Design an enzyme around this catalytic site. Structure first.
Site, PDB file in Angstrom:
ATOM      1  N   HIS B 387       0.829  -1.190   0.000  1.00  0.00           N
ATOM      2  CA  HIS B 387       0.000   0.000   0.000  1.00  0.00           C
ATOM      3  C   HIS B 387       0.871   1.250   0.000  1.00  0.00           C
ATOM      4  CE1 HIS B 387      -3.203   2.665   2.130  1.00  0.00           C
ATOM      5  NE2 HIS B 387      -3.123   2.909   0.835  1.00  0.00           N
ATOM      6  N   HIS B 392       1.327   5.123  -3.005  1.00  0.00           N
ATOM      7  CA  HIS B 392       1.625   6.485  -2.556  1.00  0.00           C
ATOM      8  C   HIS B 392       3.069   6.909  -2.797  1.00  0.00           C
ATOM      9  CE1 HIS B 392      -2.126   7.208  -0.219  1.00  0.00           C
ATOM     10  NE2 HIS B 392      -2.177   5.891  -0.315  1.00  0.00           N
ATOM     11  N   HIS B 579      -4.077   0.546  -6.377  1.00  0.00           N
ATOM     12  CA  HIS B 579      -4.460   1.185  -5.122  1.00  0.00           C
ATOM     13  C   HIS B 579      -5.834   0.717  -4.646  1.00  0.00           C
ATOM     14  CE1 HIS B 579      -5.792   4.547  -2.419  1.00  0.00           C
ATOM     15  NE2 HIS B 579      -4.629   4.204  -1.894  1.00  0.00           N
ATOM     16  N   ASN B 583      -6.589  -1.083  -0.832  1.00  0.00           N
ATOM     17  CA  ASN B 583      -7.047  -0.062   0.105  1.00  0.00           C
ATOM     18  C   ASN B 583      -8.516  -0.252   0.468  1.00  0.00           C
ATOM     19  OD1 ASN B 583      -7.647   3.396   0.410  1.00  0.00           O
ATOM     20  ND2 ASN B 583      -6.208   2.251   1.708  1.00  0.00           N
ATOM     21  N   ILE B 706      -6.741   8.483  -1.064  1.00  0.00           N
ATOM     22  CA  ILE B 706      -6.976   8.273   0.353  1.00  0.00           C
ATOM     23  C   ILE B 706      -5.976   7.240   0.881  1.00  0.00           C
ATOM     24  CG2 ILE B 706      -8.654   6.377   0.256  1.00  0.00           C
ATOM     25  CD1 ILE B 706      -8.926   9.666   2.322  1.00  0.00           C
TER      26      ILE B 706
HETATM   27 FE   LIG Z   1      -3.998   4.751   0.272  1.00  0.00          FE
END
Ligand SMILES: [Fe+3]
Ligand SMILES: [Fe+3]
Lengths: 705, 706
Positions: B387, B392, B579, B583, B706
């Site tokens: 993750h 990110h 993602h 997530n 997010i």
């Molecule tokens: Fe995330």
């Protein structure tokens, strides 16, 4: 020539205006010897006893009278209750002799003479075979037995001490509704059953074969008062749970039903070699497992399938005939292999038959959980009705009736048996009133519903036999054991860590050695067994009356040698203490819905996939039914207390001390077994120690709950 | 003659007096230079006035006159006259014989007291640098210069400056030396992607640490017990939140690559014998390997170097771990074994034990406790690597290079832009409160203060751009082999693998949209090589954003349209598909050692007597679960909204409509799969349908949001 003070000790428990003042009890002493000049009994000598002192619920009555110095040894005391209320006599003491006091143990309610005017008799603690009875006591010994038999007629009253037999025709309540009509258990080929105590109430006007119900049931007066989600715990419970009596060795393969295929569909089991080998082949093949005695089974299929159709007509329950198969693995622990559930042909449909196994995909694992739910309901019912009710309570009551009908209270075998029969007849009367009756607790909370008690009758008819109720013969009968003189207790166990069998065989051996010592003190050879007319009558009556429906079976033991007697008595005592202890709480008693895989609809199946927890809760007992069974779960231990007569014979007392000591030794043996890392069926992470057969916190000596 | 232009600026909702009294300066910029001189034409405009307000929107209007020889308008300039910033939505120019011209803005325009420089907005037409209309070439370059800044200064909230720095802002050595953390990035020991430069003072205590702050800069426009069941434990490796770890077992027996002079014997204690006891009723171990039926999640070699130091932390412990699985004939996985290893430490030997599903109570409880440790390891790895790192953390450098080196006018900027929304801000929030010293992760996850370092180890040891695309990832893990006759051209060794089955549908749909889009603008290799903005972009990604990997030979070349399609499809997959699948629960820490590790008599007896107590002592506390689940509690979706530049071009708009339709198709395919009784890894009693990759809502966002 001899002044005697008689002291009577009475226990308090809560027409009397006209009680005979200062003459509560008539006491009469009986000589052990007949008049040597005439051969007839001497007249008893007596006086009245008056109230003398009250201390803490205990009342003394005193009588003072004179006895000639040639009267002979006093061998019994006669008592009459002059007042209008029964009294509980603890014991009588006769002081004033030069040989010290004489105690008479009474432990008895003595009825008002206005209910029963016959005198009660109490004998000394010395025990005798009939032919050894002192000449002055022979006729009163016999007359007392006659009194206990009664004459076979009449409605029994609360003060009666009359022991006799009758069938189970009092469980239904046809007078409330025809829906509560139940079949008579006993006296027919279709419904064989042990007899129970005769009560003699009027027969019903709606159902003539039924005895009318009553809120009070007579007994003779002195008889009155989710862990299984884990496969390894589900399995371990067959060996150390509350029903350790069902598991048996697989010998045949494939498994095959004995029932008629024309009525019941294909008899061959759906448990295949392929299914089992997918699970166990990393250890061995099915052929090796059969040969090496590694496959075990609890098989309820043939007993339950003939009831499936009837039971399924009952709203809120269902039934299958079921099998649970187990592999004995490398830690000597059982691994569940499969559960088979069968519905016979009914309603234009063929036989339905499916096998469920432990599974690593979600649907198969949910079907397995539901399959265990049904099987555990079947095992709960079988435990309650057969392992527990039938084989301890029900078959034992006829022994109790016969004991009081045919063995004198001064007979040694009466005094051996006596403590092991306490409270059972009263508990059984409570069961007929409120447990196994129509719409009672079992019918309303257990899978078979109104067919529950009938199933115990089928188990009695098909399976029960006296000669496999002892623990070695039961283990042998189930294929768990073969005889082996080297092995411990002479038995080689196919399941070596079997906590119930291991601990039970210690108890069994200790009881047997005590019964052996006791019998050998009184019966020196076979001719003394053969010539005991009370003993012969007792065993003949148990078979031909108490268990009349099986009287012609060939498996009834003979009673011709001291060893025959030891075998019979050890079996009875084992049942009332060890067996009953071993069968006395997470399991469901009823499974209320069929498997989702049984003739599913497209949308019923989808509802199960979406919320299988809801399906489980719909199958499990309602929180009321569970609260019913649990809340319904309502003295001294085996080896703690001497009976008065045992303590009076120095040799019998010594044998009891050795019995007590062996029981204490077994407590320490069991405590060490529960600490043994190698006994994985009783020791392990989260595993409750096996203490059901542990003396002294404890094994009861009778069926009292 | 001349033309009368009505310029309308739409602004979304400073003190009141300035708000109502001041307006904007709007100017229009010719696409062409003066053809007689080559010189830029001066822009033309006028100051605006309030025109209308409704529904949270203010409209400013400027009216002016343009010469008939001015040429096509290629841009508009905006100068805010308020002393407070202002969010511009779009600009419309009316009065031309050809019709209105819409300029999309979607940008905060700073107070003129903060930055007096005018802001430029280009039309919706996209141009490679060499195709830039002559009047826009200089301003296109000047805009990139503005966005890069000069590498100095503390960035302020009104800045639009994109640049790089190391992760030197996670510790708090101005509070405790215990809150000191190693700089992540820029060394052999701690390789890491760069992040957006913030430029705050360095610590005087720790001079390599940037001082902490309650407000973190981003460029202005970037700102806003089921596993008790073995069957669900193993199904989640395929359909849970971390489908990225399972691999084909290639070598047998298993063996560590770590140096035995330090880490003990390298042979696994998982033996043929242990596995054969479980699977021989299906096949031999030898045939399970040959037929690709044995799979593993193997954290042993990455975790073992941290075990000694993590075990010095009060309230946690660590093992190197492996979880082995058997794919049975219904294509479901059966868990076989978990191996837990402690390296030699404290003069003690390597400790190494194997746990399996068991037929007796003690072995069964030890299996549950081992599952607890491995799940904590899987949870940390999912959070830190699957993750945080792979979505990110590696993406932020693409965002920085995109703004520094690709003009807002560039077609590839406009392809990527929506997929980069919110990521820089979220990452800022993560540096502030999630991966910082004593932050949420350090406080609730097994590695404690070594958590971010393990993600640096994963980056340094495993991350490579060319396996971040889904086909390459599956081939790398042994799940797929290239096979022309199979669907997607990949034969899968785990055929019912919901993440991979659904992900390959998304991958192909994204790839043909990217292919259509690239082919519209790059007609041959020569147009890719001569694109100086695109080459600078990719050079900055490899040599600055991912500087610690700059020398690896696995970086894609960027010479052909097909090179570009590979690069962009990978990026868009990571920001959307990858993602979404990790997530949109398991324990994040296991606090005590296995009872079977160097047991004492009394400790072992306690465990036997109360194993449930031992489980609770191992599992996270109620606070640690709260912090996680409260933090884990926190736009449009892929194929839903046309970017303005995409709608402006008829062929691109048509390509997007085909993309949108394919995504809608994929939704119906996925709903069908979730009803297939043969797909036992996504359909079954109590099995939640696998919907993480289902377009049009659990929803595939277009960006890491997010
Ligand atoms: Fe995330
Ligand atoms: Fe009982």
């Amino acid at each position: 020539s001899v002044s005697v003070k008689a002291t009577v000790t009475v226990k308090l428990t809560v027409d009397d205006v006209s009680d005979w003042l200062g003459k509560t009890l008539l006491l009469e002493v009986v000589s052990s010897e007949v008049d040597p000049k005439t051969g007839l009994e001497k007249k008893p000598i007596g006086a009245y006893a008056h109230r003398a002192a009250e201390k803490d619920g205990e009342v003394t009555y005193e009588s003072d009278f004179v006895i000639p110095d040639d009267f002979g040894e006093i061998g019994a005391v006669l008592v009459q209750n002059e007042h209008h209320k029964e009294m509980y006599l603890r014991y009588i003491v006769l002081d004033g002799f030069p040989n010290g006091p004489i105690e008479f143990n009474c432990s008895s309610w003595v009825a008002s003479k206005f209910d029963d005017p016959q005198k009660r008799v109490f004998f000394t603690n010395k025990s005798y075979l009939p032919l050894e009875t002192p000449s002055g006591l022979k006729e009163i010994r016999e007359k007392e037995l006659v009194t206990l038999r009664g004459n076979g007629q009449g409605e029994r009253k609360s003060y009666d001490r009359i022991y006799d037999y009758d069938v189970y025709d009092d469980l239904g309540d046809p007078d409330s509704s025809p829906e509560l009509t139940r079949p008579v258990l006993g006296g027919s080929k279709q419904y064989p059953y042990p007899r129970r105590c005769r009560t003699g109430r009027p027969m019903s006007k709606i159902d003539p074969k039924a005895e009318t119900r009553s809120s009070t049931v007579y007994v003779p007066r002195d008889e009155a008062f989710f862990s299984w989600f884990r496969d390894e715990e589900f399995s371990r419970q067959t060996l150390a749970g509350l029903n350790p009596y069902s598991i048996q060795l697989v010998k045949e393969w494939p498994l095959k039903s004995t029932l008629d295929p024309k009525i019941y569909g294909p008899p061959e089991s759906a448990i295949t070699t392929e299914i089992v080998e997918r699970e166990i082949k990393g250890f061995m093949t099915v052929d090796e497992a059969l040969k090496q005695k590694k496959l075990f089974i609890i098989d309820y299929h043939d007993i339950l399938l003939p009831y499936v159709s009837e039971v399924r007509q009952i709203k809120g329950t269902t039934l299958y005939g079921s099998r649970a198969l187990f592999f004995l693995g490398p830690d000597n622990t059982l691994k569940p292999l499969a559960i088979e559930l069968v519905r016979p042909p009914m309603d234009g449909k063929p036989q339905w038959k499916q096998v469920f196994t432990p599974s690593w995909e979600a649907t198969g694992s949910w079907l397995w959980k539901l399959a265990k739910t049904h099987f555990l309901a079947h095992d709960a019912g079988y435990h309650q009705l057969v392992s527990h009710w039938l084989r301890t309570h029900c078959v034992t009551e006829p022994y109790i009736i016969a004991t009081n009908r045919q063995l004198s209270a001064m007979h040694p075998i009466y005094r051996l048996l006596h403590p092991h029969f306490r409270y059972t007849m009263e508990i059984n009367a409570l069961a007929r009133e409120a447990l196994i009756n129509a719409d009672g607790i079992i019918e309303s909370a257990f899978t078979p519903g109104k067919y529950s008690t009938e199933i115990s009758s089928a188990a009695y008819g098909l399976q029960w036999r006296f000669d496999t109720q002892g623990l070695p013969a039961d283990l042998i009968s189930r294929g768990i054991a073969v005889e082996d003189p080297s092995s411990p207790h002479g038995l080689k166990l196919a399941i070596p860590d079997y906590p119930f069998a291991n601990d039970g065989l210690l108890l069994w051996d200790a009881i047997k050695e005590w019964v052996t010592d006791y019998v050998n003190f009184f019966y020196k050879d076979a001719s003394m067994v053969k010539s005991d007319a009370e003993l012969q009558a007792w065993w003949t009556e148990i078979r031909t009356r108490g268990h009349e429906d099986k009287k012609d079976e060939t498996w009834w033991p003979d009673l011709k040698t001291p060893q025959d007697l030891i075998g019979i008595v050890t079996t009875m005592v084992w049942v009332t203490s060890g067996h009953h202890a071993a069968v006395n709480p997470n399991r469901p008693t009823i499974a209320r819905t069929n498997l989702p895989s049984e003739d599913p609809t497209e949308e019923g199946w989808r509802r199960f996939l979406h919320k299988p927890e809801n399906e489980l809760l719909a199958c499990l007992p309602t929180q009321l039914q569970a609260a019913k069974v649990l809340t319904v779960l309502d003295e001294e231990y085996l080896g703690e207390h001497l009976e008065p007569a045992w303590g009076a014979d120095p040799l019998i007392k010594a044998a009891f001390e050795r019995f007590s000591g062996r029981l204490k030794e077994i407590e320490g043996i069991i405590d060490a077994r529960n600490e043994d890392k190698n006994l994985k069926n009783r020791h392990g992470a989260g595993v409750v120690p096996y203490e059901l057969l542990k003396p002294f916190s404890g094994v009861p000596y009778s069926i009292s709950i």
